Amino acid sequence: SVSVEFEAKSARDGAWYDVAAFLSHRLFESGDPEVRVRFSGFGAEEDEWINVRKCVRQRSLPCEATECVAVLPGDLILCFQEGKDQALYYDAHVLDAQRRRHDVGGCRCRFLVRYDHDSSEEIVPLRKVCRRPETDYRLQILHAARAA
């Protein structure tokens, strides 16, 4: 079996959060079903009705040190925007990558990213980057290139 986990976008801030549970559903004649979500590590008061098609998706993957090669210019990623009054995961696109040899601490690469919601730009390390799960494909391809 392979586990499938989800993240949901909050209407409060436009950031994405891990989903702990789906509590209820509601339907409209106009379409676009909504689901009531309990967010991981937040509890009942933060519960939200979420557009299933638009704002629920398979969870983004925090990157392993070796997986920086699957983070490419042009990609949408889920990026940790760490400020002083808030620190939240936002969609961003990778503009450029500065790839450097790894050391004892792992990946030393740096990524220039542009957040989708405000067009602001930031240089971030791999530890702030979450991969969309389909990029597993890339890694799989790479894995097939190894020696038997």
């Binding site: 950031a15 925090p62 760490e82 808030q86 620190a87």
Partner: peptide
Amino acid sequence: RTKQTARKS
């Protein structure tokens, strides 16, 4: 694996 802890507002 594990995400960083979000802090709202």
